[PDB]
Design a protein around this ligand. Structure first.
Ligand SMILES: Nc1ncnc2c1ncn2[C@@H]1O[C@H](COP(=O)(O)OP(=O)(O)OP(=O)(O)O)[C@@H](O)[C@H]1O
Ligand SMILES: Nc1ncnc2c1ncn2[C@@H]1O[C@H](COP(=O)(O)OP(=O)(O)OP(=O)(O)O)[C@@H](O)[C@H]1O
Ligand SMILES: Nc1ncnc2c1ncn2[C@@H]1O[C@H](COP(=O)(O)OP(=O)(O)O)[C@@H](O)[C@H]1O
Ligand SMILES: [Mg+2]
Ligand SMILES: [Mg+2]
Lengths: 714, 115
């Protein structure tokens, strides 16, 4: 923010020769009305105009008409710099040239009709290359200032010779100069652009600053990004708005040159860069010109790489030239190039973000004729992974859908298309939507299943969820939660589904392994199986490990490997172990010590009320009529596990389903009900069933329980 | 007027027999623009560097007779992976083709097809 900086504003009565500045800023600059000043804008475009003042002008604004706006390659609201332009001499001979289509069909004398009255006693200051529009004749004609004497700044005095004979300027050349490419055009990389500008222009602008601190500037800047991000565009933009001379080298262009003629081209590029210091050298697609020296099938490529190495090492920074490179594969670039001293700084150009890609779409579509309905923000959101090149292709596809929509009314065979169609033609949101359509970017088990053991489930939450439930309390109070729990009892308590439920409640994957599955009848495979299982648990954290028939695992070093990895697993605090045993006596105490299996939870056979709960769950899974008594089924299943009661429900369901299907098929066949179960089928399933666990197993588990009362003194 | 550049390169790819060069024949027979045909292996020449100059001269022949269409049959014959090419002249030809394709925007009136 400087007083020389002035926001662009519209002009009221300012012609091509006068500009208006506010009185307070007129005095602030120590300027006077009528003085000649130098105007600077974007893309290194300058102008000279007479300075005036307007009391209706805002201080932070500057008045200049549309033609002056074009000559500064800016729009309303843009920022330009104002400075005095002393010692602009009277013109002797200046050459102006017209624009072709502005003069097409005009056969008069250009001088008398347009230039002399417009330059009559005006003392207009004009710089070479300035474009000015003159009214008159049959139609306004544009002119280009190609030559002045003196140059670049001159005053058109009455004695100044004005001539316009020669060649008119084409529309394509002026259009290419007008649109062209600037810093504002590149969007979505403002961070990278700022880094690039501070890295490259500061050595160009202030070599003395680096001299005082004594630190040499970076020699080379390397651009690496996925194809389509716009590194070549950034190279062009840097080539535009930098005072230093810019020399662009394309890797394919150097490769296409014959052997020894690429060497001469590289030498000539470096020689010109040092000759016209300050300067910049850009080598685009550095991977193409510099393959890996270790792996290259052609001697010419190695020679070119080594020549580039020698030339970059020979740079003494007195010329202060900066070499700059871009690539699609940074690793493809030779390691010697990436070492310190050569291309020391590497800049990453990533995929644009939502705001960045919205910005990109703005510049891409601002040339395009647009309707009101289409919204760019929605398109930007729907392009999650699209890089700028994909955005340009998408814009082309949307335009093509607009073309297709207007295709029916138009005729291909015609030599020309109708004007009413093209003014009728416009791109909408639907075209962008179709382009988006074609465009391509670059547990289950719950607690309700198990009936009963609600206190055991609360204990399970204490085991697993409490570290996540209140991590801060765990941090304050020294706490390492138990990582292993033993479930001892008959195979009739649903511990298998308790493990799945505890894993599901935390949305953690659950791993179950059977006991004989660990064995492999190999010297070290069985132990490696245990180690691999523990590694799976560690990497799949958070997770719970279940070892079905864990006792069957327990001469035998597999169990010892289990103890070893259970000691090792303590580093990761979010992996859990659960144990299942068929007989509690066999398992070794070293398995059941604290730190491996410190929590012993008895799994009891289902309660009669718990059996009714299982019956309610089975009624949920399968519709059942109320004629049967849940209490009766629970009573008759005293010696039967929850699994066998569920199997009774399944068999009753099968029998009742068969009855319903047979009745409905009989009705359907005579033309050519009760999926809910009856008490009869439940009696059938009761008498089909056989006992799961006898009394003796319960005696063993109870004895193990008995193998397992304090008041503090005073 | 709408402000979109025409597509400068079209690649026709498919299994043998599908009718790619048949599309090329149909276009060459019923297009208004001048048609230039390039066969990949035909580019090769014994003289040093004359094959890249042949690609170049084909492109400038398209330039003089603008608008024009260039058909490059059997593109894989002259456009292999430069990472996998063991020959200097073939690599130079691929790079020369890349430079021509990059300048095809400068051409503004030439469209190239390949099968
Ligand atoms: N951030 C951006 N802002 C504006 N236009 C962009 C942006 N990113 C890409 N584009 C557009 O997409 C195209 C990018 O072409 P360009 O050759 O510069 O890409 P690149 O990623 O540098 O190429 P390469 O893979 O050959 O190195 C241009 O048409 C450019 O206008
Ligand atoms: N879609 C089609 N309609 C009509 N004729 C077809 C079609 N596709 C192929 N043919 C005919 O079948 C033959 C295919 O030969 P052609 O060389 O044109 O095929 P191609 O797939 O382009 O060839 P290649 O894969 O060898 O480059 C020709 O005789 C052609 O006329
Ligand atoms: N005590 C029980 N309470 C509720 N459901 C049970 C009970 N025991 C078993 N089940 C159910 O029976 C099915 C098989 O259980 P099972 O694996 O035999 O139990 P265990 O784990 O004791 O061997 C499981 O889906 C489970 O839901
Ligand atoms: Mg590029
Ligand atoms: Mg063919």
């Amino acid at each position: 923010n400087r007083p020389n900086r002035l926001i662009v504003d519209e002009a009221i009565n300012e012609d091509n020769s006068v500009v208006s500045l506010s009185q307070p800023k007129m005095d602030e600059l120590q300027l006077f009305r009528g003085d000649t000043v130098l105007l600077k804008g974007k893309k290194r475009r300058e102008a000279v105009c007479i300075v005036l003042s307007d009391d209706t002008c805002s201080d932070e604004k500057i008045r200049m008409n549309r033609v002056v706006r074009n000559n500064l390659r800016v729009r309303l609201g843009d920022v330009i710099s104002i400075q005095p332009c002393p010692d602009v001499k009277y013109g002797k001979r200046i050459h102006v040239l017209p624009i072709d289509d502005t003069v097409e069909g005009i056969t008069g004398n250009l001088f008398e009709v347009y230039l002399k009255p417009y330059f009559l006693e005006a003392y207009r200051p004009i710089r070479k290359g300035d474009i000015f529009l003159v009214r008159g004749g049959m139609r306004a004609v544009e002119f280009k200032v190609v030559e002045t004497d003196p140059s670049p700044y001159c005053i058109v005095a009455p004695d100044t010779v004005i001539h316009c004979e020669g060649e008119p300027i084409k529309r394509e050349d002026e259009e290419e100069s007008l649109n062209e490419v600037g810093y504002d055009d590149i969007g979505g990389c403002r961070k990278q652009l700022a880094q690039i500008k501070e890295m490259v222009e500061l050595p160009l602008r202030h070599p003395a600053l680096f001299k005082e601190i004594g630190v040499k500037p970076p020699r080379g800047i390397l651009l690496y990004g996925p194809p389509g991000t716009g590194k070549t565009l950034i190279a062009r933009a840097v080539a535009n708005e930098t005072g230093a001379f810019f020399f662009l080298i394309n890797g394919p262009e150097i490769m296409s040159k014959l052997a020894g003629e690429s060497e001469s081209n590289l030498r000539k590029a470096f020689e010109e860069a040092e000759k016209n210091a300050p300067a910049i050298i850009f080598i685009d697609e550095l991977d193409a010109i510099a393959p890996k020296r270790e792996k290259t099938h052609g001697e010419v490529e190695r020679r070119i790489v080594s020549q580039l190495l020698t030339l970059m090492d020979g740079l003494k920074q007195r010329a202060h030239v900066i070499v700059m490179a871009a690539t699609n594969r940074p690793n493809s670039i030779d390691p010697a190039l990436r070492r310190f001293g050569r291309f020391d700084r590497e800049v990453d150009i990533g995929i644009p973000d939502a705001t960045g890609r919205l910005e990109i779409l703005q510049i891409h579509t601002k040339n395009m004729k647009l309707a009101d309905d289409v919204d760019l923000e929605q398109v930007a959101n729907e392009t999650h992974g699209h890089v700028g090149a994909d955005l340009a292709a998408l814009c082309s596809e949307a335009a093509l859908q607009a073309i297709r929509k207007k295709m029916d009314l138009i005729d291909l065979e015609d030599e020309t298309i109708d004007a009413e169609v093209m003014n009728s033609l416009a791109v909408t949101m639907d075209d962008f939507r179709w382009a988006l359509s074609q465009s391509n970017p670059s547990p289950q088990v719950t607690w309700e299943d198990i009936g009963g053991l609600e206190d055991v489930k609360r204990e399970l939450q204490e085991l697993v969820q409490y570290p996540v439930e209140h991590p801060d309390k765990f941090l304050k109070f020294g706490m390492t939660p138990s990582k292993g729990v033993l479930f001892y009892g008959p195979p009739g308590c649903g511990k298998t589904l308790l493990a799945k439920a505890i894993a599901n409640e935390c949305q953690a994957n659950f791993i179950s392994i059977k006991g004989p599955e660990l064995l492999t009848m190999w010297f070290g495979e069985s132990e490696a199986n245990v180690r691999e299982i523990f590694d799976k648990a560690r990497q799949a954290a958070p997770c719970v490990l279940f070892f079905d028939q864990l006792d069957s695992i327990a001469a035998d070093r597999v169990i010892n490997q289990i103890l070893t990895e259970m000691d090792g697993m303590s580093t990761k605090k979010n992996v859990f172990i659960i144990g299942a045993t068929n007989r509690p006596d066999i398992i070794d105490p070293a398995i059941l010590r604290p730190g491996r299996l410190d929590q012993l939870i008895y799994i009891p056979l289902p309660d009669e009320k718990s059996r009714v709960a299982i019956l309610k769950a089975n009624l949920r899974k399968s519709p059942v009529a109320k004629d049967v008594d849940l209490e009766f089924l629970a009573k008759m299943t005293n010696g039967f596990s929850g699994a066998d009661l569920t199997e009774i429900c399944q068999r009753a369901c099968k029998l009742a389903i068969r009855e319903s299907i047979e009745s409905e098929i009989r009705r359907e066949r005579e033309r050519q009900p009760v999926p809910e179960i009856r008490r009869d089928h439940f009696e059938e399933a009761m008498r089909f069933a056989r006992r799961s666990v006898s009394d003796n197993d319960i005696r063993k588990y109870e004895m193990f329980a008995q193998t397992l009362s304090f008041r503090f003194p005073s």
